[PDB]
């Protein structure tokens, strides 16, 4: 009954202030992420994540999701997938040199 337009990590087109406000939520664990729609880029997507540190608190790392002109995506040239979910799974298993392994999603 669900679809790519309503996944556990799909919110739609949100604003920028609300973006850092959803991941910076002090009530969020380190590793939460979300897949919003392109806002300051082409009609692609944007996978943001959350991180913590003993420097000041918790910040947010925005990882723009690339889009292959053929019909796919790849935040990096070494990671291409044919489904926003597939890319969300790889990052949700091996940071592959990322800042953290995707584990939670935006509430």
């Amino acid at each position: 009954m669900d679809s790519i337009q309503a996944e556990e990590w799909y919110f739609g087109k949100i604003t920028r202030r609300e973006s850092e406000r959803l991941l910076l939520n002090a009530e969020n664990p380190r590793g939460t992420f979300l897949v919003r729609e392109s806002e300051t880029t082409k009609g692609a997507y944007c996978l943001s994540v959350s991180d913590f540190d003993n420097a000041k608190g918790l910040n947010v790392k925005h990882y723009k999701i690339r889009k292959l002109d053929s019909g796919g995506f790849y935040i990096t040239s070494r990671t291409q997938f044919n489904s926003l979910q597939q890319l969300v799974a790889y990052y949700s298993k091996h940071a592959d040199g990322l800042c953290h392994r995707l584990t939670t999603v935006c509430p």
């Binding site: 790392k61 935040i75 070494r78 990671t79 990322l98």
Partner: peptide, 5 residues
Amino acid sequence: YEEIE
């Protein structure tokens, strides 16, 4: 944003 490196 952040690059995957």
